[PDB]
Amino acid sequence: RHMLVVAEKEIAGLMTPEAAFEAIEAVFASMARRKAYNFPVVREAIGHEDALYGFKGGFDASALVLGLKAGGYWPNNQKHNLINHQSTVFLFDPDTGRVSAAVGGNLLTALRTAAASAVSIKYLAPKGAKVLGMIGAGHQSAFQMRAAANVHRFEKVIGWNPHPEMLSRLADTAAELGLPFEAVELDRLGAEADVIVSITSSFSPLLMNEHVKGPTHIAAMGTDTKGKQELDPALVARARIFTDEVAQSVSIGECQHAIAAGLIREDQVGELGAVVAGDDPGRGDAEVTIFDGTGVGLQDLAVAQAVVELAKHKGVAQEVEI
Amino acid sequence: RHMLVVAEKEIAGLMTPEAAFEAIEAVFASMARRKAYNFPVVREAIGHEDALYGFKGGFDASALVLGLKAGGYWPNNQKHNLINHQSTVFLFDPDTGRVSAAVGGNLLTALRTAAASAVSIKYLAPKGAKVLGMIGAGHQSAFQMRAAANVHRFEKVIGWNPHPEMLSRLADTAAELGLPFEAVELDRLGAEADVIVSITSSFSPLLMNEHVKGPTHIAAMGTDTKGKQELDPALVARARIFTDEVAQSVSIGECQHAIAAGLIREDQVGELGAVVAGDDPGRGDAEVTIFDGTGVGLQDLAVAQAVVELAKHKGVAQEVEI
Ligand SMILES: NC(=O)c1ccc[n+]([C@@H]2O[C@H](COP(=O)([O-])OP(=O)(O)OC[C@H]3O[C@@H](n4cnc5c(N)ncnc54)[C@H](O)[C@@H]3O)[C@@H](O)[C@H]2O)c1
Ligand SMILES: NC(=O)c1ccc[n+]([C@@H]2O[C@H](COP(=O)([O-])OP(=O)(O)OC[C@H]3O[C@@H](n4cnc5c(N)ncnc54)[C@H](O)[C@@H]3O)[C@@H](O)[C@H]2O)c1
Ligand SMILES: [Tb+3]
Ligand SMILES: [Tb+3]
Numbered sequence: 001r002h003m004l005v006v007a008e009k010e011i012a013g014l015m016t017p018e019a020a021f022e023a024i025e026a027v028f029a030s031m032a033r034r035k036a037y038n039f040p041v042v043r044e045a046i047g048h049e050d051a052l053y054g055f056k057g058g059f060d061a062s063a064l065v066l067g068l069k070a071g072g073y074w075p076n077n078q079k080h081n082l083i084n085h086q087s088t089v090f091l092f093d094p095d096t097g098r099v100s101a102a103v104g105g106n107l108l109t110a111l112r113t114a115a116a117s118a119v120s121i122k123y124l125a126p127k128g129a130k131v132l133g134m135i136g137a138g139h140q141s142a143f144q145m146r147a148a149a150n151v152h153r154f155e156k157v158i159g160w161n162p163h164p165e166m167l168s169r170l171a172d173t174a175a176e177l178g179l180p181f182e183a184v185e186l187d188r189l190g191a192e193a194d195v196i197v198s199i200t201s202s203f204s205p206l207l208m209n210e211h212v213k214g215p216t217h218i219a220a221m222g223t224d225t226k227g228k229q230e231l232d233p234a235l236v237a238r239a240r241i242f243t244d245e246v247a248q249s250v251s252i253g254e255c256q257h258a259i260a261a262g263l264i265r266e267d268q269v270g271e272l273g274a275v276v277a278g279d280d281p282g283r284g285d286a287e288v289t290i291f292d293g294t295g296v297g298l299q300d301l302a303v304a305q306a307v308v309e310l311a312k313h314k315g316v317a318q319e320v321e322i
Numbered sequence: 323r324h325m326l327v328v329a330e331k332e333i334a335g336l337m338t339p340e341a342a343f344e345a346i347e348a349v350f351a352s353m354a355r356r357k358a359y360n361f362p363v364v365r366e367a368i369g370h371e372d373a374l375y376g377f378k379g380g381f382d383a384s385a386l387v388l389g390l391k392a393g394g395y396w397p398n399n400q401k402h403n404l405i406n407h408q409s410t411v412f413l414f415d416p417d418t419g420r421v422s423a424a425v426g427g428n429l430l431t432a433l434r435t436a437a438a439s440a441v442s443i444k445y446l447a448p449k450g451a452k453v454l455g456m457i458g459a460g461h462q463s464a465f466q467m468r469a470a471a472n473v474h475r476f477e478k479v480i481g482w483n484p485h486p487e488m489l490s491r492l493a494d495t496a497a498e499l500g501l502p503f504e505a506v507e508l509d510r511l512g513a514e515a516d517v518i519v520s521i522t523s524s525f526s527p528l529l530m531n532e533h534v535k536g537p538t539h540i541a542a543m544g545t546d547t548k549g550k551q552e553l554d555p556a557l558v559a560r561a562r563i564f565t566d567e568v569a570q571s572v573s574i575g576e577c578q579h580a581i582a583a584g585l586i587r588e589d590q591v592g593e594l595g596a597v598v599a600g601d602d603p604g605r606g607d608a609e610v611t612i613f614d615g616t617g618v619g620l621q622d623l624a625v626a627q628a629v630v631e632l633a634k635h636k637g638v639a640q641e642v643e644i
Contacts, residue, residue: 074419086419097408
């Protein structure tokens with residue numbers, strides 16, 4: 001009996017935005033139909049090298065995926081010539097309990113996060129969305145724009161960056177996709193962008209309520225810890241809200257600040273997967289929609305189960321006896 | 323950069339009861355000195371194949387060992403020609419966060435469980451213990467007897483089992499250890515066994531309060547789940563109690579019943595590691611001592627780290643790129 005290992009350097013040549021979209025769109029519908037759930041997250045500051053280490057487990061009864069993503073954040077990894085984020089996904093056989101696969105989760109995390117916002121664009125973007133708005137130009141921004149253009153045909157890409165130095169990262173990605181780009185200010189972005197994808201490590205409201213005008217869908221992907229914030233709580237409180245895990249959205253998600261101040265209800269925080277499964281009308285007659293993407297382990301298990309199938313069909317899945 | 327893999331079939335040729343004893347003894351001391359700790363345990367009934375699946379993580383700052391054991395219990399694994407207990411230890415580099423090793427955990431679990439019971443024997447057994455009492459003849463009962471005979475020199479082994487046909491497993495291993503065996507009922511076992519080791523999956527009190535007579539150390543290893551029970555809560559109430567994790571002992575351990583009945587309070591539950599680290603005198607003049615072995619992830623981590631060290635020396639550690 002052997003287990004499969006898919007090295008990190010193989011993920012780029014195997015995964016695609018289409019393959020990432022299929023896995024995440026499917027795992028959203030399973031969570032809505034209560035065929036899949038996330039385990040309680042373990043998150044520990046081990047008190048050594050300032051590390052944050054933990055596990056994100058889950059089980060998908062619809063796709064028979066069982067396992068976890070283990071790892072975290074090592075801020076001092078520069079001395080090792082390594083990136084700060086280090087994670088690994090372990091898959092187990094749901095029928096027997098044996099380990100089945102082990103895949104690096106660094107690039108997979110960026111792809112499933114980009115695929116998550118792409119699902120919210122497919123099911124919540126306004127009719128005939130013209131301009132794509134990008135708030136932030138970090139490492140994740142290139143994956144977010146590529147996943148957005150893969151699911152919706154855009155005509156213009158406008159972008160704003162809290163740090164104007166790396167504004168060129170959005171322009172290179174927009175030119176890569178064959179779309180024009182224009183660096184705009186935050187007030188003009190909310191008025192022209194029909195779809196807005198924010199992906200910053202911000203601790204204060206960036207996109208204000210008076211900025212957003214007209215039908216607009218917002219993919220709030222930045223806030224994933226207690227304390228972070230990207231949107232004006234007044235802006236969150238006028239939009240129909242969808243998320244991946246309601247418990248995480250009201251605690252460490254973008255909605256954490258509006259539910260605490262009593263600006264929105266907890267029972268009004270919808271599930272994006274409920275729209276994919278057809279149980280939720282979706283955008284409906286709301287002018288502004290917000291997808292509060294917080295990140296769940298089932299997203300990491302779905303794309304990991306996809307790369308192991310693509311790897312062994314390609315011939316790059318390492319067979320290991322264990 | 324790469325990842326090591328130690329197959330399950332190599333564990334037997336690498337681990338010895340003495341090597342497992344030295345690892346677990348040191349881990350008990352590190353926990354008492356607060357140089358190591360266990361992460362919050364995840365334990366989920368996923369609903370598929372009646373399986374119990376979860377993670378037991380931990381970190382040993384003294385030995386710089388980090389990781390978790392993943393897996394659990396598949397009650398119907400006999401139809402797959404597999405044992406019901408399936409687990410796997412994943413070690414991570416504490417300085418970088420990258421995964422370092424994956425080790426088969428089936429044989430490791432039984433070894434460290436037997437080592438934990440042997441540590442309590444070395445530090446809590448009555449002076450000159452001559453008769454070892456085995457309550458349970460399951461799979462792990464053989465490992466418990468071998469580890470107990472390795473740390474302490476016994477003259478006789480008496481055994482009892484709810485299903486009396488399995489007693490051949492105790493007699494066979496008693497023959498391997500050069501020790502005579504006699505099957506008995508629980509009334510004689512409690513009055514003649516100086517050291518008692520219970521390793522049953524029971525939900526009813528077996529060893530009663532008036533069964534135990536004279537100086538006796540009871541290594542209760544079977545109860546690791548809310549609802550299981552091996553001992554009479556009255557017997558637990560009159561004994562000097564030690565455990566590996568006080569939080570688990572009062573909830574899923576043997577003390578869960580004497581705690582709920584108000585017979586004892588959690589501050590009356592000691593730590594076996596404090597006896598190992600010299601901070602606790604241990605037995606003293608008490609007539610009955612109990613070690614509530616529930617199982618902690620650091621035990622798996624310590625015994626797996628030693629296996630990786632031996633596997634690299636013996637040359638049986640598979641180098642895998644990830
Ligand atoms: N929701 C998910 O599933 C998921 C997954 C991965 C990452 N993320 C989140 O995405 C966010 C960015 O990911 P990245 O890796 O692209 O980070 P990154 O640091 O590469 O980009 C940082 C962005 O945050 C902005 N920024 C930095 N400090 C700021 C401050 N003090 N105030 C306002 N803006 C500030 C920078 O201008 C830049 O745009 C992080 O917050 C991360 O947690 C979410
Ligand atoms: N504490 C630890 O660190 C640790 C580690 C591993 C296993 N365990 C526990 O050890 C126990 C047995 O381990 P095993 O894998 O050797 O199990 P096993 O099933 O091989 O043997 C189980 C024994 O329990 C007894 N038993 C079974 N059903 C019973 C019932 N209904 N009432 C009373 N007695 C009954 C029988 O004597 C049987 O031999 C399990 O409960 C397991 O959780 C503890
Ligand atoms: Tb059943
Ligand atoms: Tb028979």
